[PDB]
Design a protein around this ligand. Structure first.
Ligand SMILES: *[C@@H]1O[C@H](CO)[C@@H](O[C@@H]2O[C@H](CO)[C@@H](O)[C@H](O)[C@H]2NC(C)=O)[C@H](O)[C@H]1NC(C)=O
Ligand SMILES: *[C@@H]1O[C@H](CO)[C@@H](O[C@@H]2O[C@H](CO)[C@@H](O)[C@H](O)[C@H]2NC(C)=O)[C@H](O)[C@H]1NC(C)=O
Ligand SMILES: *[C@@H]1O[C@H](CO)[C@@H](O[C@@H]2O[C@H](CO)[C@@H](O)[C@H](O)[C@H]2NC(C)=O)[C@H](O)[C@H]1NC(C)=O
Ligand SMILES: *[C@@H]1O[C@H](CO)[C@@H](O)[C@H](O)[C@H]1NC(C)=O
Ligand SMILES: *[C@@H]1O[C@H](CO)[C@@H](O)[C@H](O)[C@H]1NC(C)=O
Ligand SMILES: *[C@@H]1O[C@H](CO)[C@@H](O)[C@H](O)[C@H]1NC(C)=O
Ligand SMILES: *[C@@H]1O[C@H](CO)[C@@H](O)[C@H](O)[C@H]1NC(C)=O
Ligand SMILES: *[C@@H]1O[C@H](CO)[C@@H](O)[C@H](O)[C@H]1NC(C)=O
Ligand SMILES: *[C@@H]1O[C@H](CO)[C@@H](O)[C@H](O)[C@H]1NC(C)=O
Ligand SMILES: *[C@@H]1O[C@H](CO)[C@@H](O)[C@H](O)[C@H]1NC(C)=O
Ligand SMILES: *[C@@H]1O[C@H](CO)[C@@H](O)[C@H](O)[C@H]1NC(C)=O
Ligand SMILES: *[C@@H]1O[C@H](CO)[C@@H](O)[C@H](O)[C@H]1NC(C)=O
Ligand SMILES: *[C@@H]1O[C@H](CO)[C@@H](O)[C@H](O)[C@H]1NC(C)=O
Ligand SMILES: *[C@@H]1O[C@H](CO)[C@@H](O)[C@H](O)[C@H]1NC(C)=O
Lengths: 415, 451, 197, 49
């Protein structure tokens, strides 16, 4: 810590000690069902863009590593999560959306985007977490005469709020005259067909889009995947895993009055203070494992190589990862003597340490304020000096320091 | 707003006002000396137990070593402040078991051995009035490990890597130093601060103190019971004011409150995202892949490092202020307690006589005993007196007249005396002083020579 | 003895050494050498890495300047104190207790030191002490006599008057005492004779 | 003679002028004007700037 080979007399804060964990705990709900990605990722016909189907997925084990064999897509484009980490963590609710768009509008399926699909047909929230899966479907959604099954809504009266669906088909008016259900002057039908052909370019091919949205709430985890559960171990420094969140600490029984809808207890510094077991209906505490500071008390290396160690703020029967217990921690390597000298190395609340010859060893003592005196006071007694001494002392005061100038362009950049 | 009452002093070129009585007043001065010592583990605060965060934190260089050095320097400086204020005496003087200091009652400021802590009545009142946060200088991880009732603020502060260190001198040692200074001040006077303690009776020490402020020492010996009663009533008023109102100790309460509030802000800054997707490091580590979690973790590292740097800079500025106040308290202990100070409005308002230190949490309390003139009266004055073609000037004093006869009296108390050649001196004649008057000057040799 | 001036030297050396050592850090970039970043990457990516290095080095330089400002405040407070000590101890005689050394101040001498000043304070310390019996006043012919500038002491049989800081006993005389009132009000007045020359 | 009080005035004026002039810097973004950033780009890129 001092980056040197000789140290001077004093007390130095070197490092910090910590109790290492010894066990790993994984706590997951007992779910055996398998999530039906098979019934979603292939179909004869997907739904249209204006009338997209929403499928609720709950209470199953979700394997996301199988999705690659099911459709020929390149990118498993996720936003709030990562595709490779979808099995470790786990969710509350999963929703699946299905529609077929043109390849020009694949980039419109993203949070904070506008256009034609994103403004009228399918709008994503700004704080969206989840994955968007899209792949080419020229083989199944193209005809030489033209595929008119898929339709998109051209324009609306106002912009669409996120995750909303519009089915009703009323004739739009952009003027003063009423249309009266007849597409005459200034009257347009809102729905227009894609009309897919195999002779089209690479940007106008049909594209099947499946959007998986993950609900990351504080509710009990209804749907999540295959993690092997571990038996519950209490009163030990463990590495727990409660429904996908990791941590390190001890788990104890609690007397907190959790309401039946409450699952977690939060701290002021926004960390999980209490947790509920997903298998049994019992709440637990999370207290971090034992730690503190370590200070090394030494004389100079030209005197001795002996040291004493001070574990600050630790009851000394709890020490491991001469023993004397002070109010600043406990001291290992220095013996307490029933004497009082001047303070040499300051430790704590009235305790000092020194290197004394009574074999040389490091001792700890209570510091002495000075000699005891009692002036002989009386109501008719005075003391008057008869001589004098002339004493010359020395006072040292700093006045000025080194003047420096820094060239910031040469420091930061250097030509 | 009102600046005060309007006053108009009746000024004239031959009118003077001289006090005929006095009061003994005891005031109270409160000064902060030291503040709470803290140490911060930057690795546990920024990261905790995350090894990826630690390996990303090592790329920032020595932004932790110099924060540690600054906090260590502040912690050493606080103990130096307490040592330079209180440890100004070489020996622990003891007061005698007899408690007759000339009728002055010092029982409220002297220690009582019946208490487990040898502190006076006023020191106990001062320690009870300044409420404390009960910081973690006493060992506290045994209390934090046992989850009883709710979670305290200090347990969260300790869990997040913020540690409070205990001061080197305990409150018993501060009270012992204060008791030694008090015992030396009553028993010896100012002699114990300039060498060895020379004993003197307290009445004669007070006569020396009155000679310091310009009053003849016969004023004390003829008014010893009145001065003792005034001192006792002033000490009782100090006791009643400290028992009733606790708003005087706002400086020490602010010293406690600022250091609680800064640590609370430092803990509350861990809930912030700083532009990342989560404030929890484990959620970022278990939610995204290596590169993107590295990006979010670096954003969190930058935010937490900035908040820690802001805390250290504010602590350095507060340490500069506290060191200035401790230097002032050391000067006041050297000059008010160990001696008698002629500087105006230093050592209390009035004419300073004595002072007494009293220990308080995070500071010191001075009880300044001063002399205040009370009841004045109008007179007629002259600069000199013409007598036999000579101009007489007073040696120490002032010429006053009660309408018909001319006297000479000292300035700070009305004690009129016959004008004599012993208390006057001659310089020149009567043709140069403006405002001279005609009067006779007594000669003590003539009636002794004629008899 | 000169540890204060030694610490003034040491802090200003250590701050510059830390500022030099801070140039070897990466601050999240792929390298700390700037030419390696410029040669190994194109314009946009090297702009990103250089921006990280610029932010880190600018923050370290700001930390150095703020620390220098606070140390300058401390040094200016100490220099103001040394100027007051030069004006009051060297250029005069000071009645302030524990200013200008411990004892009763007589003289002071300045000496120049690196980054500071050294004061040699010449003081007066009483040495050898003696117990005496004392009194506030002395009754004589129904009058109370107080000392002019001194204190009444007794060697056991005779009564003298002496100065307070040096044992120089003298005969009690109406020249060195003054009269105020009778002997019925002072607590502790003793009976003795007062010499009339 | 009153250069100390003049310096007390001048330091405050210079500090506030520097604080106003610091609003014209880009700090690595594409523009120092906030509405120009908000109109030129979409949500994510403007959030970075
Ligand atoms: C000087 O002031 C004191 C009080 O400051 C006066 O003492 C008071 O006298 C009255 C009348 O005798 C008593 O009722 C009070 O109890 C006294 N106060 C005490 C003893 O604290 C004193 O009389 C004044 N002297 C002159 C000459 O006016
Ligand atoms: C001014 O003070 C003098 C001295 O005390 C007063 O003179 C005395 O007055 C009383 C009362 O009348 C007489 O009994 C004394 O004989 C006087 N002493 C003398 C003349 O030496 C004088 O009355 C005072 N003048 C005032 C108050 O106007
Ligand atoms: C106290 O001091 C007086 C003054 O000197 C001492 O009296 C003298 O003592 C010497 C020594 O015997 C005699 O020669 C003188 O004749 C004495 N002079 C007078 C005027 O008495 C006295 O002895 C001292 N007492 C003590 C106890 O020290
Ligand atoms: C899961 O475990 C809980 C508690 O042991 C039990 O009540 C529940 O019936 C279990 N569910 C299944 C499907 O086994
Ligand atoms: C697509 O899913 C359907 C659903 O039953 C299944 O019959 C079909 O075999 C799947 N396609 C392939 C290529 O496996
Ligand atoms: C929902 O109702 C509001 C009425 O405030 C209307 O403006 C909006 O278009 C409706 N949305 C759908 C999808 O029907
Ligand atoms: C904690 O330390 C105190 C102080 O010595 C002691 O009384 C107590 O028993 C300790 N707690 C333990 C050992 O659990
Ligand atoms: C003076 O001191 C003696 C002994 O120390 C004591 O007996 C006496 O009471 C004191 N005088 C007064 C007036 O109390
Ligand atoms: C002194 O005061 C009186 C009354 O106020 C005045 O008449 C007189 O002129 C003053 N003396 C001088 C020298 O002005
Ligand atoms: C001194 O004051 C205390 C408390 O005010 C009182 O109890 C005590 O009697 C006083 N001392 C004397 C000698 O009267
Ligand atoms: C002195 O005289 C002035 C004016 O005559 C008067 O206002 C004042 O009350 C008198 N007394 C004192 C004590 O100043
Ligand atoms: C004072 O006396 C002298 C001589 O006796 C005389 O000349 C002078 O006028 C007198 N002064 C006053 C003010 O009466
Ligand atoms: C004075 O008397 C006290 C007690 O009677 C004694 O301890 C001391 O040694 C004597 N001498 C001096 C010089 O103080
Ligand atoms: C002093 O002398 C007077 C009379 O001469 C007498 O009344 C008094 O008692 C004496 N003092 C002592 C202490 O004996």
């Amino acid at each position: 810590t001092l980056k040197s080979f000789t140290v001077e007399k004093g007390i130095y804060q070197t490092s910090n000690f910590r109790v290492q964990p010894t066990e790993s705990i994984v706590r997951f709900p007992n779910i055996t069902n398998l999530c039906p990605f098979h019934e979603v990722f292939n179909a004869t016909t997907f739904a249209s863009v204006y009338a997209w189907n929403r499928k609720r997925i709950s209470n199953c084990v979700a394997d996301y590593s199988v999705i690659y064999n099911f459709a020929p897509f390149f990118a498993f484009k996720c936003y709030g999560v990562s595709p490779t980490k979808l099995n470790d963590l786990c969710f509350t609710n999963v929703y699946a959306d299905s529609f077929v768009i043109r390849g020009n509008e694949v980039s419109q399926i993203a949070p904070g985007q506008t256009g034609n699909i994103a403004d009228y047909n399918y709008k994503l929230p700004d704080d969206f977490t989840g994955c968007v899966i899209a792949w080419n479907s020229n083989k199944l959604d193209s005809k030489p005469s033209g595929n008119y099954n898929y339709l998109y809504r051209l324009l609306r009266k106002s912009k669409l709020k996120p995750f909303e669906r519009d089915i009703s088909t009323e004739i739009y008016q952009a003027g003063n005259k009423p249309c009266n259900g007849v597409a005459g002057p200034n009257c347009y039908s809102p729905l227009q067909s894609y009309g897919f052909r195999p002779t089209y370019g690479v940007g106008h091919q049909p594209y099947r889009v499946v959007v998986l949205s993950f609900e990351l709430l504080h509710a009990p985890a209804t749907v999540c995947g295959p993690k092997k559960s571990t038996n519950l171990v209490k009163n030990k420094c463990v590495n727990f895993n409660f429904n996908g969140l990791t941590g390190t600490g001890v788990l104890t029984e609690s007397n907190k009055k959790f309401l039946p809808f409450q699952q977690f207890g939060r701290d002021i510094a926004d960390t999980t203070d209490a947790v509920r077991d997903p298998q049994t209906l019992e709440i637990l505490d999370i207290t971090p494992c034992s730690f503190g500071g370590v200070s090394v008390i030494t004389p100079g290396t030209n005197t001795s190589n002996q040291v004493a160690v001070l574990y600050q703020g630790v009851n000394c029967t709890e020490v491991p990862v001469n023993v004397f217990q002070t109010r600043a921690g406990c001291l290992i390597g220095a013996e307490y003597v029933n004497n009082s000298y001047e303070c040499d190395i300051p430790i704590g609340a009235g305790i000092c340490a020194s290197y004394q010859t009574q074999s040389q060893s490091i001792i700890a003592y209570t510091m002495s304020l000075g000699a005891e005196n009692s002036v002989a006071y009386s109501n008719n007694s005075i003391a008057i000096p008869t001589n004098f001494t002339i004493s010359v002392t020395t006072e040292i005061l700093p006045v000025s320091m080194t003047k420096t100038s820094v060239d910031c362009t040469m420091y930061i950049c250097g030509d | 707003m009102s600046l005060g009452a309007e006053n108009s002093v009746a000024y004239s070129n031959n009118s003077i006002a001289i006090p005929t009585n006095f009061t003994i007043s005891v005031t109270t001065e409160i000064l902060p000396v030291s503040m709470t010592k803290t140490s911060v583990d930057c690795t546990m605060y920024i990261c905790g137990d995350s090894t990826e965060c630690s390996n990303l934190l090592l790329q920032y260089g020595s932004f932790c070593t110099q924060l540690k050095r600054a906090l260590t320097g502040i912690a050493v400086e606080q103990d130096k402040n307490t040592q330079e204020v209180f440890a100004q005496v070489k020996q622990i003087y003891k007061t005698p078991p007899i408690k007759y200091f000339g009728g002055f009652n010092f029982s409220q400021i002297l220690p009582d051995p019946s208490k487990p802590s040898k502190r006076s009545f006023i020191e106990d009142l001062l320690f009870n009035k300044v409420t404390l946060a009960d910081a973690g200088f006493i060992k506290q991880y045994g209390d934090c490990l046992g989850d009883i009732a709710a979670r305290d603020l200090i347990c969260a502060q300790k869990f997040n890597g913020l540690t409070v260190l205990p001061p080197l001198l305990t409150d018993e040692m501060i009270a012992q130093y204060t008791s030694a200074l008090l015992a030396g001040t009553i028993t010896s006077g100012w002699t114990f601060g300039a060498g060895a303690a020379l004993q003197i009776p307290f009445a004669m020490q007070m006569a020396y103190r009155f000679n310091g402020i310009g009053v003849t020492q016969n004023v004390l010996y003829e008014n010893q019971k009145l001065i003792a009663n005034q001192f006792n009533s002033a000490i009782g008023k100090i006791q009643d004011s400290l028992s009733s109102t606790a708003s005087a100790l706002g400086k020490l309460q602010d010293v406690v409150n600022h250091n609680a509030q800064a640590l609370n802000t430092l803990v509350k800054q861990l809930s912030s995202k700083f532009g990342a997707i989560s404030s929890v490091l484990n959620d970022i580590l278990s939610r995204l892949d290596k590169v993107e979690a590295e990006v979010q973790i670096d954003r969190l590292i930058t935010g937490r490092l900035q908040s820690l740097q802001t805390y250290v800079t504010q602590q350095l500025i507060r340490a500069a202020e506290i060191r200035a106040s401790a230097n002032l308290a050391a000067t006041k202990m050297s000059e008010c307690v160990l001696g008698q100070s002629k500087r105006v409005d230093f050592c209390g308002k009035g004419y300073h006589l004595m002072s007494f230190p009293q220990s308080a949490p995070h500071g010191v309390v001075f009880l300044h005993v001063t002399y205040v003139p009370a009841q004045e009266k109008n007179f007629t004055t002259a600069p000199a007196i013409c007598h036999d073609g000579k101009a007489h000037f007073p040696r120490e004093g002032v010429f006053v007249s009660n309408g018909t006869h001319w006297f000479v009296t000292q300035r700070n108390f009305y004690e009129p005396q016959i004008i004599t050649t012993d208390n006057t001196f001659v310089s020149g004649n009567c043709d140069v002083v403006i405002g001279i008057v005609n009067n006779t000057v007594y000669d003590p040799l003539q009636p002794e020579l004629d008899s």
